[PDB]
Amino acid sequence: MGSALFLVIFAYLLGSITFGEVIAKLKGVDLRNVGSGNVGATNVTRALGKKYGVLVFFLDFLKGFIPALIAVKSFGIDSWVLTFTGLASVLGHMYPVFFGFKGGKGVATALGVVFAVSPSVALFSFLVWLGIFLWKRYVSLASITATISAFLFLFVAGYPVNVLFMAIVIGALIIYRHRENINRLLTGREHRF
Ligand SMILES: CCCCCCC/C=C\CCCCCC(=O)OC[C@@H](O)CO
Ligand SMILES: CCCCCCC/C=C\CCCCCC(=O)OC[C@@H](O)CO
Ligand SMILES: CCCCCCC/C=C\CCCCCC(=O)OC[C@@H](O)CO
Ligand SMILES: CCCCCCC/C=C\CCCCCC(=O)OC[C@@H](O)CO
Ligand SMILES: CCCCCCC/C=C\CCCCCC(=O)OC[C@@H](O)CO
Ligand SMILES: CCCCCCC/C=C\CCCCCC(=O)OC[C@@H](O)CO
Ligand SMILES: CCCCCCC/C=C\CCCCCC(=O)OC[C@@H](O)CO
Ligand SMILES: CCCCCCCCCCCCCCCC(=O)OP(=O)(O)O
Ligand SMILES: CCCCCCCCCCCCCCCC(=O)OP(=O)(O)O
Ligand SMILES: [K+]
Ligand SMILES: [K+]
């Protein structure tokens, strides 16, 4: 139906606004030059400082949270509308429709989707991320581990098949976007903080 289609397209368009690009050009920085050349909060931090990375993290978080919250409240956590809305937000971050935006890895946006479903599951997944990051100082290893953990937490918390499907497909896409990070991790050559 039309309302579900509207929300899903809105989520994709909103997700396509990679805010790292918005703030990096705002002070003249070729984000694709600095650091790793990525648009996510991690390279924003590396290029502009921690304060700007946190702002980008929150903005990229909100473009997952806001459409998914609308889906939760308008259709239900058990609705496949939520499934496709959350996926659309993350796909927009990864494959932005706007010609001049390059995609990111979707981790902050995916956390926003999870938080709209269950703040508890999201906070536990973020604790996994933080613990892994403090342990080894690899952002990629923390994002991969916490992405898998979010699926396990949603499963043990009893969330339904449409949510688990959403989490498995989003998690597969996130891990695919980390394929070069994984090759570096396998040979001890990942960039360390
Ligand atoms: C390139 C354009 C991006 C968007 C492409 C189209 C998105 C695909 C599907 C949107 C509708 C999903 C409906 C899911 C569903 O069964 O909802 C229950 C009901 O409300 C639908 O009539
Ligand atoms: C479910 C949302 C939970 C998030 C609440 C707190 C949000 C604040 C910051 C998020 C961005 C990542 C922060 C990582 C961080 O502080 O790393 C510190 C690291 O440099 C070692 O001290
Ligand atoms: C449900 C809670 C899960 C919390 C995380 C526990 C899962 C176990 C391990 C996380 C990944 C550890 C990877 C260690 C490793 O060999 O990293 C590569 C190494 O070269 C880094 O120094
Ligand atoms: C190895 C250490 C333990 C790791 C965690 C393993 C599982 C731990 C806790 C699961 C508790 C889930 C409580 C929520 C739950 O199932 O609620 C069902 C209910 O919310 C349905 O409305
Ligand atoms: C090292 C492993 C640590 C594991 C810690 C596990 C404790 C985490 C969570 C406790 C679950 C609380 C119950 C949540 C709950 O009932 O929420 C939903 C539902 O019951 C509402 O009807
Ligand atoms: C990088 C890896 C990405 C992999 C993506 C794979 C996507 C796989 C399968 C798509 C299955 C769509 C199922 C739709 C569905 O069950 O709709 C529920 C329906 O009851 C709504 O009324
Ligand atoms: C809860 C499940 C977490 C899964 C995390 C998977 C992370 C994926 C790839 C990282 C590969 C790490 C590099 C392997 C490596 O150095 O192995 C040596 C290792 O045995 C030392 O502990
Ligand atoms: C199911 C998902 C569960 C996700 C659990 C882990 C969430 C970690 C968030 C904190 C880290 C955020 C900073 C990395 C983002 C970035 O640099 O870039 P993007 O990936 O955004 O392009
Ligand atoms: C670095 C180590 C970090 C270790 C963290 C591992 C512990 C997680 C246990 C699973 C808990 C998941 C269930 C949430 C409860 C729920 O159902 O909540 P509501 O959705 O009803 O609000
Ligand atoms: K990278
Ligand atoms: K593009």
Side-chain angles (χ1 to χ4, degrees), residues 79-81 83-84 87 95 162 165 168-170 172-174 176:
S79 177
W80 284 85
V81 178
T83 303
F84 293 127
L87 273 162
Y95 305 101
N162 68 295
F165 180 92
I168 203 83
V169 180
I170 287 172
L173 286 161
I174 291 174
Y176 177 69

Side-chain angles (χ1 to χ4, degrees), residues 59-177:
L59 296 170
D60 284 339
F61 171 99
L62 282 177
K63 53 190 201 182
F65 173 72
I66 283 164
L69 184 62
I70 295 170
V72 162
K73 294 304 178 206
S74 297
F75 297 94
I77 284 165
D78 66 334
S79 177
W80 284 85
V81 178
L82 167 61
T83 303
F84 293 127
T85 298
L87 273 162
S89 287
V90 174
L91 285 169
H93 186 91
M94 295 180 173
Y95 305 101
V97 68
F98 306 111
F99 183 86
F101 282 155
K102 100 183 223 164
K105 297 178 191 187
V107 177
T109 299
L111 180 67
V113 174
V114 177
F115 193 95
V117 174
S118 165
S120 312
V121 171
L123 284 174
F124 272 102
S125 303
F126 182 79
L127 254 202
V128 168
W129 189 92
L130 251 201
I132 298 293
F133 178 71
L134 296 168
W135 183 27
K136 298 281 198 162
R137 314 299 300 199
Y138 299 123
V139 171
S140 55
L141 179 65
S143 299
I144 292 162
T145 304
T147 291
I148 292 159
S149 297
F151 168 82
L152 303 176
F153 293 151
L154 288 167
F155 174 71
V156 301
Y159 282 97
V161 57
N162 68 295
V163 174
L164 302 183
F165 180 92
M166 181 187 71
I168 203 83
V169 180
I170 287 172
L173 286 161
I174 291 174
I175 291 167
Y176 177 69
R177 300 288 281 175

